[PDB]
Design a protein around this nucleic acid. Sequence first.
DNA 1: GGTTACAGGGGTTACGGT
Length: 305
Amino acid sequence: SLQLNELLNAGEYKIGELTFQSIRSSQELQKKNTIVNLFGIVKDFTPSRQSLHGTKDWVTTVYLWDPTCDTSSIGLQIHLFSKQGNDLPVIKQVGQPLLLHQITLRSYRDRTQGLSKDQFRYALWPDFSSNSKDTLCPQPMPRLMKTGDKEEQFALLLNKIWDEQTVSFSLLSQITPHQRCSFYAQVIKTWYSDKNFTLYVTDYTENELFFPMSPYTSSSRWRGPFGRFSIRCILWDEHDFYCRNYIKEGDYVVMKNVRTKIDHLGYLECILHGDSAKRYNMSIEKVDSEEPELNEIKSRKRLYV
DNA sequence: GGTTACAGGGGTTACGGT
């Protein structure tokens, strides 16, 4: 179980006679497009179907996970393509181990993305942990690979590791552009508007890329903290409706799996986009004032009172 | 080398106090 971890945590590894990369590493935003070989498990998949525009290629889309990501993340987005016919992976159920030889990574919308090479191969195993015995179904020949002994071990582990496991919290000083992160914070300020909800929140730790709140402005109802101790969060859709008249100035919140972003004028922000498709599993929820996880915040607050 | 498939998806100036 650990021999798996050990190789993964390197970022790159090898089975049979070819070299893999882990998912987390691979999610690195590479500007230059490179040739990767992947192995993980299908946390989400679409049916193969012909695409309607351009070359109109056959296309299935999948999200490969491994232990270098948290159990919350679906993982790396990969679109597989076939110009030659419908020889794409026939995926039954989640938790199927999937190897993918000869995929490319390419960044888009500030998110690293898999795109398959024309001559891509794959190999696919069942969801061993399922009661159902038919979780693999027969696969199109053209793009298979006869997998060796070692990789079939790997497959049973990944399904096990996944099955058991189905977060990592930061201070606000520790968050950087374009990441998914989780944190406790107290609310300083809110602003509803027609089109969204906004929270200004803090854990009383300075982040370079936060706005510097002046003590010297006139007629501000912000009483503190001053400088770069507060992030703005923007809640869309369901997150708006739940918080708009629920979360209030001075509440202590815990926010899970939010996405960070630099706004137009160059300050780091939090976005919770609407997420109907149960994909990102982000949350924001009130925390009881006397909780032990909140006392590090309270203490820090004395130091800026 | 990266349309198709993505989606989603979007909002003034650190106040305004809606």
